[PDB]
Amino acid sequence: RMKQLEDKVEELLSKAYHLENEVARLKKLVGER
Amino acid sequence: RMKQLEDKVEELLSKAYHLENEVARLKKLVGER
Amino acid sequence: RMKQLEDKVEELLSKAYHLENEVARLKKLVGE
């Protein structure tokens, strides 16, 4: 229970940080102004 | 409180999964691969 | 789609950091 919840939070946070990096790259690939 | 937060982490992980799907779609759309 | 995605990713991050704080407060209560 507690440790499992903590591990899922860490899984979630790394996923979110990778999503944040992908969004930044994509914005650069789109090349809007 | 424990099941409220267990449910919350599953809800956010599901959101992250659908956002990863969207990142893969946007890379295909912008010309990548 | 690009802006919609950026906004959803910002909401995800915000929600996940708030959840992390909540989980740490719960860990103080349940220990382990």
From Swiss-Prot, chain C:
Disruption phenotype: Abolishes recruitment of the mediator complex to the upstream activating sequence (UAS) of amino-acid starvation responsive genes. Decreases RNA level of genes involved in amino acid biosynthesis and cofactor biosynthesis during amino acid starvation or methyl methanesulfonate stress. Growth dependent on amino acid supplementation. Sensitive to amino acid starvation. Sensitive to purine starvation. Decreases cellular glycogen levels during glucose starvation.
Induction profile: Translation is induced by amino acid or purine starvation, or during growth in low or poor carbon sources. Translational repression during nutrient-rich conditions is dependent on four uORFs (upstream open reading frames) present in the 5'-UTR of the mRNA; these promote ribosome dissociation. Translational induction occurs in conditions reducing translation machinery efficiency, leading to ribosomes scanning over the uORFs, and increased translation of the mRNA. The rapid translational induction is followed by transcriptional induction at later time-points, independently of the uORF sequences.
PTM section of the record: Phosphorylated by the cyclin-CDK PCL5-PHO85.
Region (Leucine-zipper), start-end ranges: 5-26
Subcellular location: Nucleus
Subunit: Homodimer. Each subunit binds overlapping and non-identical half-sites that flank the central CG base-pair in the pseudo-palindromic motif 5'-ATGA[CG]TCAT-3'. Interacts with the mediator tail; the interaction with GAL11/MED15 is direct. Interacts with the SAGA histone acetyltransferase complex. Interacts with the SWI/SNF chromatin remodeling complex.
Function: Master transcriptional regulator that mediates the response to amino acid starvation. Binds variations of the DNA sequence 5'-ATGA[CG]TCAT-3' in canonical nucleosome-depleted 5'-positioned promoters, and also within coding sequences and 3' non-coding regions. During nutrient starvation (low or poor amino acid, carbon or purine sources), it activates genes required for amino acid biosynthesis and transport, autophagy, cofactor biosynthesis and transport, mitochondrial transport, and additional downstream transcription factors.
Entry domain remark: Residues 89 to 100 and 106 to 125 define the N-terminal activation domain (NTAD) and the central acidic activation domain (CAAD) respectively, which can function independently to promote high-level transcription of the target genes.
Family stated for the protein in its record: Belongs to the bZIP family. GCN4 subfamily.
Protein name: General control transcription factor GCN4
